[PDB]
Write an enzyme that holds these catalytic residues in place. Structure first.
Site, short mmCIF file in Angstrom:
data_model
loop_
_atom_site.label_atom_id
_atom_site.label_comp_id
_atom_site.label_asym_id
_atom_site.label_seq_id
_atom_site.Cartn_x
_atom_site.Cartn_y
_atom_site.Cartn_z
N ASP A 1 -38.98 -21.28 -24.24
CA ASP A 1 -38.69 -22.33 -23.21
C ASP A 1 -39.60 -21.98 -21.62
O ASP A 1 -40.02 -20.67 -21.78
CB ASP A 1 -37.82 -21.58 -23.05
CG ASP A 1 -37.57 -20.51 -21.76
OD1 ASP A 1 -37.77 -19.69 -21.90
OD2 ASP A 1 -35.30 -20.59 -21.47
N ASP B 1 -39.36 -22.02 -17.70
CA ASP B 1 -38.44 -21.45 -17.12
C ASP B 1 -38.81 -21.91 -15.27
O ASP B 1 -40.07 -21.33 -14.64
CB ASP B 1 -38.41 -19.98 -16.69
CG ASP B 1 -38.24 -18.93 -17.82
OD1 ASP B 1 -37.10 -19.57 -18.22
OD2 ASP B 1 -39.48 -18.75 -18.85
N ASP C 1 -35.33 -24.09 -18.53
CA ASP C 1 -34.04 -23.28 -17.25
C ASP C 1 -34.38 -23.78 -15.82
O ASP C 1 -35.68 -23.57 -15.88
CB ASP C 1 -34.18 -21.55 -17.99
CG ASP C 1 -33.72 -21.50 -18.75
OD1 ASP C 1 -32.80 -21.83 -20.13
OD2 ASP C 1 -33.90 -20.51 -19.48
#
Ligand SMILES: Nc1nc2c([nH]c(=O)n2[C@H]2C[C@H](O)[C@@H](COP(=O)(O)OP(=O)(O)OP(=O)(O)O)O2)c(=O)[nH]1
Ligand SMILES: [Ca+2]
Ligand SMILES: [Ca+2]
Ligand SMILES: [Cl-]
Ligand code: NA
Length: 328
Positions: free
Chosen positions: A194, A196, A252
DNA sequence: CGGCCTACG
DNA sequence: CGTA
DNA sequence: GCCG
């Protein structure tokens, strides 16, 4: 020669003991599935010691003196050196419990506790979970629908284009606000699971209320496949363009005031083991309490003002480590 | 033996 | 409970 | 599981 805390030694992304570290990390993960956080930590710390070594481990005698290597971790290394394989590690790898907890906990919205309960109920596959969808949270439904895409690594090559769409929304939400890439990509990784991003504004206070404004603009642009919705962290699923199509990616987003930005940058840059060790070192060796918001002296009841990550390492009496050496 | 990071959604 |  |  080798210090006991991972935050006291440089740990590069690539190293000379990859196979040995990977076997110990399997045992760490299995310990986590059984709820033994202590065993998980010891296996992770032993793995990280090997990542910090300057050359390959050839012989068992080279483990003498190294921290976190006792009877158990040393026997794992010994079998890998003598036979190329550790019976205990392979038994874990091929066990139904390990494979199912790994598959379930990799779902966004499913933790160890949920995966364990499903395991005890007899569930083993993703199709099992899809046949009883009333038992699932909205978050878990999204994690399950998107699971295939989310199991594909995000490439560092994808990140720049994604940062610029986030920057566009952030600039409309609050002109002057900045976006910083953190996580594994900041430590030099070429892939990750992912992306960030850390958001701030150079005028203290201006960042209050920012993240809802950012998430409303990204959603209006059609880019948000899932998000939870005042807040300061958002865990969302983004539509990322691909040739003639698109794929779902986890992103995120975190907002911090500029006074806390060095602490947030340190925390969100990781690695996870590095930050746990840094916080343990702070509290146990320096008597200071560290988190992603600040560094607290509980005796004088004061917070340490930091303008940079360098400031934080200096206040903890630690040699500075750049992000690329924080891969514990 | 106790301890094992510390938050937010 | 989930998430980082 | 290991350290202190
Ligand atoms: N203090 C603390 N920080 C954590 C925890 N989990 C966690 O991911 N972090 C921090 C350190 C991580 O490097 C950072 C980003 O998390 P991440 O799971 O995206 O990790 P990453 O970027 O290093 O890994 P990846 O996407 O390449 O797979 O958040 C935790 O339990 N405690
Ligand atoms: Ca990441
Ligand atoms: Ca993340
Ligand atoms: Cl334990
Ligand atoms: Na999960």
């Amino acid at each position: 020669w080798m210090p006991a805390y991972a935050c006291q030694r440089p740990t590069p992304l690539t190293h000379h003991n990859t196979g040995l570290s990977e076997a110990l990390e399997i045992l760490a993960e299995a310990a986590g599935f059984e709820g033994s956080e202590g065993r998980l930590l010891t296996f992770c710390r032993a793995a990280s010691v090997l990542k910090a070594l300057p050359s390959p481990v050839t012989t068992l005698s080279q483990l003498q003196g190294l921290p976190h290597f006792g009877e158990h971790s040393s026997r794992v290394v010994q079998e890998l050196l003598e036979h190329g394989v550790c019976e205990e590690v392979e038994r874990v790898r091929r066990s139904e419990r390990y494979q199912t907890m790994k598959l379930f906990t990799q779902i966004f919205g499913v933790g160890v506790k949920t995966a364990d309960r499903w395991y005890r109920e007899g569930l083993r596959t993703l199709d099992d979970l899809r046949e009883q969808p009333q038992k699932l949270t909205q978050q878990q439904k999204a994690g399950l629908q998107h699971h295939q895409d989310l199991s594909t690594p995000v490439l560092r090559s994808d990140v720049d284009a994604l940062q610029q769409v986030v920057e566009e929304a952030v600039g409309q939400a609050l002109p002057g606000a900045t976006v910083t890439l953190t996580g594994g990509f900041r430590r030099g990784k070429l892939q990750g699971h992912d992306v960030d991003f850390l958001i701030t504004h150079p005028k203290e206070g201006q960042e209050a209320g920012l993240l809802p404004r950012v998430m409303c603009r990204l959603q209006d642009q059609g880019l948000i496949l899932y998000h939870q919705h005042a807040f300061e962290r958002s865990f969302c699923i983004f539509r990322l363009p691909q040739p003639g199509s698109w794929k779902a990616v986890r992103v995120d987003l975190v907002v911090a005031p500029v006074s806390q930005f060095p602490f947030a940058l340190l925390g969100w840059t990781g690695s996870k083991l590095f930050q746990r060790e840094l916080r343990r070192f702070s509290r146990k060796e320096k008597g200071l309490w560290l988190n992603s918001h600040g560094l607290f002296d509980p005796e004088q009841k004061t917070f340490f003002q930091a303008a940079s990550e360098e400031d934080i390492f200096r206040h903890l009496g630690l040699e500075y480590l750049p992000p690329e050496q924080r891969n514990a």
